[PDB]
Design an enzyme around this catalytic site. Structure first.
Site, mmCIF file in Angstrom:
data_model
loop_
_atom_site.group_PDB
_atom_site.id
_atom_site.type_symbol
_atom_site.label_atom_id
_atom_site.label_comp_id
_atom_site.label_asym_id
_atom_site.label_seq_id
_atom_site.Cartn_x
_atom_site.Cartn_y
_atom_site.Cartn_z
ATOM 1 N N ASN A 133 -7.660 9.402 -5.279
ATOM 2 C CA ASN A 133 -8.606 8.408 -6.080
ATOM 3 C C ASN A 133 -9.328 9.373 -7.021
ATOM 4 O OD1 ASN A 133 -9.076 7.149 -3.051
ATOM 5 N ND2 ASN A 133 -7.838 6.312 -4.494
ATOM 6 N N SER A 178 -11.571 11.368 -3.451
ATOM 7 C CA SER A 178 -11.038 10.785 -2.010
ATOM 8 C C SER A 178 -9.676 10.645 -2.032
ATOM 9 C CB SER A 178 -11.997 9.764 -1.681
ATOM 10 O OG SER A 178 -11.619 8.583 -2.471
ATOM 11 N N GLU A 180 1.014 -1.366 -0.132
ATOM 12 C CA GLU A 180 0.045 0.046 0.033
ATOM 13 C C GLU A 180 0.881 1.340 0.133
ATOM 14 O OE1 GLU A 180 -3.235 0.551 -0.177
ATOM 15 O OE2 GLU A 180 -4.082 -1.480 -0.170
ATOM 16 N N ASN A 192 -9.002 5.540 3.506
ATOM 17 C CA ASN A 192 -9.646 6.237 2.685
ATOM 18 C C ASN A 192 -10.601 7.332 3.321
ATOM 19 O OD1 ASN A 192 -12.304 6.467 0.578
ATOM 20 N ND2 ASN A 192 -10.377 6.572 -0.473
ATOM 21 N N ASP A 197 -6.236 8.423 -0.218
ATOM 22 C CA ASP A 197 -5.777 7.707 0.818
ATOM 23 C C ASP A 197 -4.629 7.883 1.660
ATOM 24 O OD1 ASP A 197 -7.781 5.752 -0.420
ATOM 25 O OD2 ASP A 197 -6.386 4.822 -1.721
ATOM 26 N N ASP A 243 -12.462 9.425 -7.620
ATOM 27 C CA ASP A 243 -13.664 10.080 -7.031
ATOM 28 C C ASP A 243 -13.560 11.174 -6.248
ATOM 29 O OD1 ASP A 243 -12.591 9.028 -4.651
ATOM 30 O OD2 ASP A 243 -14.316 7.552 -4.414
#
Ligand SMILES: [Cl-]
Ligand SMILES: [Cl-]
Ligand code: NA
Length: 129
Positions: A46, A50, A35, A59, A52, A48
């Site tokens: 991301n 958002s 990750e 998220n 991380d 959309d």
């Protein structure tokens, strides 16, 4: 902070992640590796809108507040910046709530695609725990 592999294993074990909801320590270290490359300061945006955050790439749509993910929830009740600390406590406590929500570690795409079904014990081999 960029953790070493065994250093992170030890930190996660102390914070209660070994066998948490049935996931052995190697699973958590493997997920952190893919990750974030063990980097507590990692961020990724991301599609959309958002973002991380942190060593486990938690998220902002569901788990933390970063003030720029409209209509998101803050289920861990933390600012997302707290997830970037060199102290992994905030990340670990939030991850415990994610992994308990029904879908286990499948919440982490890199765990699903690169750790699940592999010899995850290799990630803690040679470490003094
Ligand atoms: Cl393991
Ligand atoms: Cl599970
Ligand atoms: Na949020």
């Amino acid at each position: 902070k960029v953790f070493g592999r065994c250093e992170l294993a030890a930190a996660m074990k102390r914070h209660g992640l070994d066998n948490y909801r049935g996931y052995s320590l190697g699973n958590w270290v493997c997920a952190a590796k893919f990750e974030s490359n063990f980097n507590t300061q990692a961020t990724n945006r991301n599609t959309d809108g958002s973002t991380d955050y942190g060593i486990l790439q938690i998220n902002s749509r569901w788990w933390c507040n970063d003030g720029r993910t409209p209509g998101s929830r803050n289920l861990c009740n933390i600012p997302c910046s707290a997830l970037l600390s060199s102290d992994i406590t905030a990340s670990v406590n939030c991850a415990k709530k994610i992994v308990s929500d029904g879908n286990g570690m499948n919440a982490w795409v890199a765990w699903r695609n690169r750790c699940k079904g592999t010899d995850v014990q290799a990630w803690i081999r040679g470490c003094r725990l």
